[PDB]
Amino acid sequence: EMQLTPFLILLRKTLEQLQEKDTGNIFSEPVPLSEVPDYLDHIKKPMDFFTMKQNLEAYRYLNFDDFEEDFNLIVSNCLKYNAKDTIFYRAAVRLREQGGAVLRQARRQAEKM
Ligand SMILES: CCn1c(=O)c(C)nc2cc(C(=O)N[C@@H](C)c3cnn(C)c3C)ccc21
């Protein structure tokens, strides 16, 4: 199959590209429960890009689909929690669109290895 090191290099680059699409950095860190005290009542598995970076370096993404699954959680959690008329909801829609294109290109690179 493929070697670990180039795959992790690719995931690192892809994660950076996804964060670049989050210009407000609203997905960069876990949603602050100090300010959203009911968040865990609705969201079973919080996700954010800092947690994704920790998972990456902890060797918890060994295939592309697990990495993409956690990105999709960032999006879906935000769509679930926030009303449609909020900036947060619309930011998740835009991230789904822009991040999907980043991910399709990165997957093509993974399939080259
Ligand atoms: C879009 C994801 N997201 C949500 O889905 C919901 C429901 N709330 C969010 C709230 C913040 C947030 O509070 N950011 C800044 C003002 C702040 C204030 N104090 N602290 C410690 C921080 C980080 C960020 C993202 C959020």
Swiss-Prot record:
Q: Where does the UniProt annotation locate this protein?
A: Nucleus; Chromosome; Cytoplasm
Q: Where is the Bromo domain?
A: 2-106
Q: Provide the coiled-coil residue spans.
A: none
This protein is called Peregrin
Instruction: Report quaternary structure and partners.
Output: Component of some HBO1 complex composed of KAT7/HBO1, MEAF6, ING5, and BRPF1. Component of the MOZ/MORF complex composed at least of ING5, KAT6A, KAT6B, MEAF6 and one of BRPF1, BRD1/BRPF2 and BRPF3. Interacts (via PHD-type zinc finger domains) with unmethylated histone H3 at 'Lys-4' (H3K4me0). Interacts with trimethylated 'Lys-36' of histone H3 (H3K36me3). Interacts with ING5; interaction directs BRPF1 to H4K4me3-enriched chromatin at the 5' of active genes. Interacts with KAT7.
Tissue-specificity statement: High levels in testis.
Protein purpose: Scaffold subunit of various histone acetyltransferase (HAT) complexes, such as the MOZ/MORF and HBO1 complexes, which have a histone H3 acetyltransferase activity. Plays a key role in HBO1 complex by directing KAT7/HBO1 specificity towards histone H3 'Lys-14' acetylation (H3K14ac). Some HAT complexes preferentially mediate histone H3 'Lys-23' (H3K23ac) acetylation. Positively regulates the transcription of RUNX1 and RUNX2.
Q: Which disease is it linked to?
A: Intellectual developmental disorder with dysmorphic facies and ptosis: An autosomal dominant neurodevelopmental disorder characterized by delayed psychomotor development, intellectual disability, delayed language, and facial dysmorphisms, most notably ptosis. Additional features may include poor growth, hypotonia, and seizures.
Post-translational modifications reported in the UniProt record:
Acetylated by KAT6A.
